[PDB]
Design a protein around this ligand. Structure first.
Ligand SMILES: [Mg+2]
Ligand SMILES: [Mg+2]
Ligand SMILES: [Mg+2]
Ligand SMILES: [Mg+2]
Ligand SMILES: [Mg+2]
Ligand SMILES: [Mg+2]
Ligand SMILES: [Mg+2]
Ligand SMILES: [Mg+2]
Ligand SMILES: [Mg+2]
Ligand SMILES: [Mg+2]
Ligand SMILES: [Mg+2]
Ligand SMILES: [Mg+2]
Ligand SMILES: [Mg+2]
Ligand SMILES: [Mg+2]
Ligand SMILES: [Mg+2]
Ligand SMILES: [Mg+2]
Lengths: 48, 82, 145, 141, 143, 63, 206
RNA sequence: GACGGAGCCAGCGAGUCUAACCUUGGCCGAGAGGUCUUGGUAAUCUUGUGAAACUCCGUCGUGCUGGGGAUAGAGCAUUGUAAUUAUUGCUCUUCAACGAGGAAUUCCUAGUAAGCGCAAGUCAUCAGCUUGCGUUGAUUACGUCCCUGCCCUUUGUACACAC
RNA sequence: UUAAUUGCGAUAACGAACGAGACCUUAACCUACUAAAUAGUGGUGCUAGCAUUUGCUGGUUAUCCACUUCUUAGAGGGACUA
């Protein structure tokens, strides 16, 4: 909101930032990512 | 025997016990100009004792210099009469 | 509501019974400084001498002080009822005294001497420096000296 | 006969009975006028219903209170409760109901415990402590 | 309108009545006065000492005017207090009995109270009149 | 030494190691339509009012 | 106004203080407009009380004490440190004398004086331990108005207490000193000094 | 705030037979207590258990001081066959440390904490303890899982007297 | 979701048991029942004092009369988050 109000060039875009993240297993488990699953749900290959 | 303390002494004021003419007329000329008068005032100002302060307060209220508004024991509250 | 100014014969520390008694404090608790004289005894003798207790000790007369001293030195002569006394039915003569400044220490000491030379339990206890009134010594009087 | 009611005010362990009849406006407490309840400040605490509703409503009636139990503060709270409840009882039995409604509304708008007793009661004492909830002291070493 | 002991503050009544008794100067004082503590639990004797027997007697008179019957036991219970037992915790100790006993005996001899059935002491007619008149004047001092 | 009044409109949740801190979404009274998020120490309600000694700051939201 | 008579004489003192207007001990609860916003609805005025002794129950729910009269909260805070626990009559007497003194000095309404003191010695920003475990710091946060009021009362009473301790001045006049200096803004009062200390610390730990 | 006077309010409970309990009242005693009687086998009598903190008037006046009251001397009483290493109570005198407590650590969310005393238990006597009772009556959360632990689920384990 | 394997429910499980809860005691309400000199209150007799103009404060066991708000209980009601 502040940026749009203080911006010249209305309508503009506010573009995005893109980076592909590679984590190791240890870091991903520590960072509240792929945490841990039951023996049966380990086989679940889909996302939420 | 370790105490675990500091034990810093004080200055030990020597408030007066009995008065003379100099303290008396100082009282009589200085209990006015005081908007609030009580034992604490007559000890943090003029260095008389608290007993002398009680007696002097009763005396001055006898004459009429200080006006009372509540004379509850352990806290006497007087103002100056104008 | 009494304000008398004063006349400058007031005296600070005075002397009686070989005790530097303080002025500038009321006579009862001033006289309490005298070993052998407590609040009750001093209040009573200052009542019997008919000196005002509202007066500070430094503001008093030599005749009043001498009257008070005479009373405390022979109190039973002035209708003191013989149970205010610290040494009554003494141990030797059977009369009733009231010890004072240095006589208190001397009398305590000769009592301890009597018990020690008698080899009584309390005397042996006093000599060893322990408790004598039957207290427990297991947890108290550790750094007693 | 005379128009007469009798009510009670309560606190922890104090109860104040209050006879309220028709009279000339004397308000006594155990033998004595209302100005000698003897904390000297809860005196103003007990004047409250009179001061609220106006002393004109006490001119035609006699109130006499007998208090027992508790301590000084609880006795005062019981006295004021009994006075208010006896006034309301008189205005309900002999005066009409509109005055009772106005009086009750004033009393409860100032303070709820004027007419209704405080339901707070002592919690009992349980072992292992000096009190209900407190325990003595734990020693580990 | 009439008045009674119950229409005036107790402090005012007791002060007035003790002043009346001290000025009248006929009741009594035993002789062990100016020596005693009034209680085995008190630590020092009274501070006034120019009286206080009249204060005690006025308090007893008000007490018996209020009540029906009392005794030296009740009065010791009433005038006793917390004895500071040094390093041990405090405890109720009842007052001295000779004091109140002789107070009641003097009140009898001056005629303010009498001995009563069911044991104890009771307020008499002339004593009731005396206390009522002293209360009337105690109230209208404020004119 | 200026300060800013801010009215609470939404309590989000508790925060802090020990639960003595609360997140709130305040809307500024003056300069209205501005809605910042803040940490709060004590008992707080909506429609309460806070005095921000510093207004140009947002707390890390937990959600 | 007219004075009413009864079989038991009721003083004209209580009659005036009763029916013309409902006062405090002998003071009024009108003309006590609060200086600072954000403490309205949390300091209780406009519900007058004859005395600061109300056997009320404000501890049962959370924000009920905000409806308790502020003078009763002051009295309640005045009685602590053991020997003083209980003894609310002494706190009421101390408050009566304190308001008398705050009338003879500083002739403003003493209720206005105390509410000004509360508004002025209320810490607005304070610190608190925030962290994820071993990485934990004292971060600065806002302060709620109820906590502002409570901390103000605590600071005032504690300063008055440890001032009146071991000296000849009384708890009442020490509290009067504290309240007046806090309503003015002094840096001599325990309360204002602690307030500025906390605010400076929170500024440094932003 | 200590002291001295006045004011002056509770509740839970116990109590004598082949016995000697709770004791009013009167008298004596500074006091403790003694003595002559009395009531009660108890909602009736002790006991309104006239408790204490509390309030009001005064004394004191920031002084290890009239704060505090251990440590000691002497005497008077009571319980008990017997108190001597004091059973306890009382009187006078002596009047020590202690100037709010370091590293640490306990209990507690409303009539609760805390302060205040009372009854009963043990008991011939001996409360600073306990079990309950009531009197005065705050502050501060009404939340979190950071420490200390508990519960359920998933997960890993070379553990099974089981971290 | 609950203080609660307490419930909603989902469901290779169905139907049960124990515990929890329900239960018992106690504290709080009943100017509605039963009553009661071993608890009270009011009035009337006798009586003390002050006022006196009716009144105010009290005492009074064999003065009785009446009642049960306070007190005691027994049977019941009441809250079940309405
Ligand atoms: Mg407790
Ligand atoms: Mg007393
Ligand atoms: Mg104590
Ligand atoms: Mg001080
Ligand atoms: Mg002492
Ligand atoms: Mg006292
Ligand atoms: Mg009772
Ligand atoms: Mg722990
Ligand atoms: Mg015992
Ligand atoms: Mg033994
Ligand atoms: Mg034991
Ligand atoms: Mg909780
Ligand atoms: Mg592994
Ligand atoms: Mg194995
Ligand atoms: Mg290992
Ligand atoms: Mg009659």
């Amino acid at each position: 909101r502040d940026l749009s109000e203080a911006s010249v060039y209305p309508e503009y875009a506010l573009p995005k930032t893109y980076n592909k993240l590679h984590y190791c297993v240890s870091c991903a488990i520590h960072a509240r990512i792929v945490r841990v699953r039951s023996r049966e749900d380990r086989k679940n290959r889909a996302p939420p | 025997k370790k105490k675990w303390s500091k034990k810093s002494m004080k200055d030990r004021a020597q408030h007066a016990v009995i008065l003379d003419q100099e303290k008396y007329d100082r009282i009589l000329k200085e209990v006015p100009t005081y908007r609030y008068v009580s034992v604490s005032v007559l000890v943090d100002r003029l260095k008389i004792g608290g007993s002398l302060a009680r007696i002097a307060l009763r005396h001055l209220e006898k004459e009429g210099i200080i006006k009372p508004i509540s004379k509850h024991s352990k806290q006497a509250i007087y103002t100056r009469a104008t | 509501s009494l304000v008398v100014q004063e006349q400058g014969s007031f005296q600070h520390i005075l002397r009686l019974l070989n005790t530097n008694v303080d002025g500038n404090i009321k006579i009862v608790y001033a006289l309490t400084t005298i070993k052998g004289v407590g609040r009750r005894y001093s209040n009573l003798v200052c009542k019997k001498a008919d000196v005002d207790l509202h007066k500070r000790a430094g503001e008093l007369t030599q005749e009043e002080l001498e009257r008070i001293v005479q009373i405390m030195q022979n109190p039973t002569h002035y209708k003191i009822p013989a149970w205010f006394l610290n040494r009554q039915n003494d141990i030797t003569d059977g009369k009733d005294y009231h010890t004072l400044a240095n006589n208190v220490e001397s009398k305590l000491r000769d009592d301890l001497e009597r018990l020690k030379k008698i080899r009584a339990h309390r005397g042996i206890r006093h000599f060893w420096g322990l408790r004598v009134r039957g207290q427990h010594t297991k947890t108290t009087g550790r750094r007693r000296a | 006969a005379v128009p007469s009611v009798q009510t009670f005010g309560k606190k922890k362990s104090a109860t104040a009975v209050a006879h309220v009849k028709a009279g000339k406006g004397l308000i006594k407490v155990n033998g004595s006028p209302i100005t000698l309840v003897e904390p000297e400040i809860l005196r103003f605490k007990v004047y409250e219903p009179l001061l609220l509703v106006g002393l004109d409503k006490f001119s035609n009636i006699d109130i006499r209170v007998r208090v027992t139990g508790g301590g000084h503060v609880s006795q005062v709270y019981a006295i004021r409760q009994a006075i208010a409840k006896g006034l309301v009882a008189y205005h309900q039995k002999y005066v009409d109901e509109q005055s009772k409604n106005e009086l009750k509304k004033a009393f409860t708008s100032y303070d709820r415990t004027l007419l209704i007793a405080d339901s707070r009661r002592p919690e009992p004492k349980k072992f292992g402590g000096k009190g209900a909830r407190s325990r003595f002291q734990k020693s580990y070493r | 309108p009439g008045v009674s002991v119950r229409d005036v503050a107790a402090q005012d009544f007791i002060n007035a009545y003790a002043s009346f008794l001290q000025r009248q100067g006929k009741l009594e004082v035993p002789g062990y006065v100016d020596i005693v503590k009034t209680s085995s639990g008190n630590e020092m004797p009274p501070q006034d000492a120019e009286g206080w027997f009249y204060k005690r007697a006025a308090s007893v008179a008000r007490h018996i005017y209020m009540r029906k019957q009392v005794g030296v036991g009740k009065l010791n219970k009433l005038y006793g207090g917390a004895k500071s037992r040094g390093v041990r915790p405090y405890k109720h100790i009842d007052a001295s009995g000779s004091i109140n006993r002789k107070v009641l005996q003097a009140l009898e001899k001056i005629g303010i109270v009498e001995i009563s059935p069911k044991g104890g002491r009771r307020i008499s007619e002339n004593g009731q009149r005396d206390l009522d008149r002293i209360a009337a004047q105690t109230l209208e001092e404020d004119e | 030494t200026p300060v800013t009044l801010a009215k609470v409109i939404k309590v989000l949740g508790r925060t802090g190691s020990r639960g003595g801190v609360t997140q709130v979404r305040v809307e500024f009274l003056e300069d209205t339509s501005r809605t910042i998020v803040r940490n709060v120490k004590g008992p707080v309600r909506e429609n309460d009012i806070l005095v921000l000694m510093e207004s140009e700051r947002e707390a890390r939201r937990l959600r | 106004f007219t004075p009413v008579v009864l079989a038991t004489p009721i003083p004209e003192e209580v009659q005036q203080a009763q029916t013309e207007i409902k006062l405090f001990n002998k003071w009024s609860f009108e003309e006590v407009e609060v200086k600072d916003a954000s403490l309205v609805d949390y300091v209780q005025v406009r519900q007058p009380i004859f005395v600061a002794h109300t056997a009320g129950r404000y501890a049962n729910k959370r924000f009920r004490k905000a409806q308790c009269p502020i003078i009763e909260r002051l009295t309640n805070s005045l009685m602590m440190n053991g020997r003083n626990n209980g003894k609310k009559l002494k706190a009421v007497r101390i408050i009566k004398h304190t308001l008398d003194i705050i009338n003879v000095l500083t002739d403003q309404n003493p209720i206005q004086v105390v509410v000004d003191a509360i508004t002025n010695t209320g810490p607005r920003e304070d610190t608190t331990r925030v962290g994820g475990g071993g990485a934990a710091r004292r971060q600065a946060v806002d302060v709620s108005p109820l906590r502002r009021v409570n901390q103000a009362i605590a600071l005032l009473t504690i300063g008055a207490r440890e001032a009146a301790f071991r000296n000849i001045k009384t708890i009442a006049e020490t509290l009067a000193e504290e309240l007046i200096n806090a309503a003015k803004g002094s840096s001599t009062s325990y309360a204002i000094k602690k307030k500025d200390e906390l605010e400076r610390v929170a500024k440094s730990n932003r």
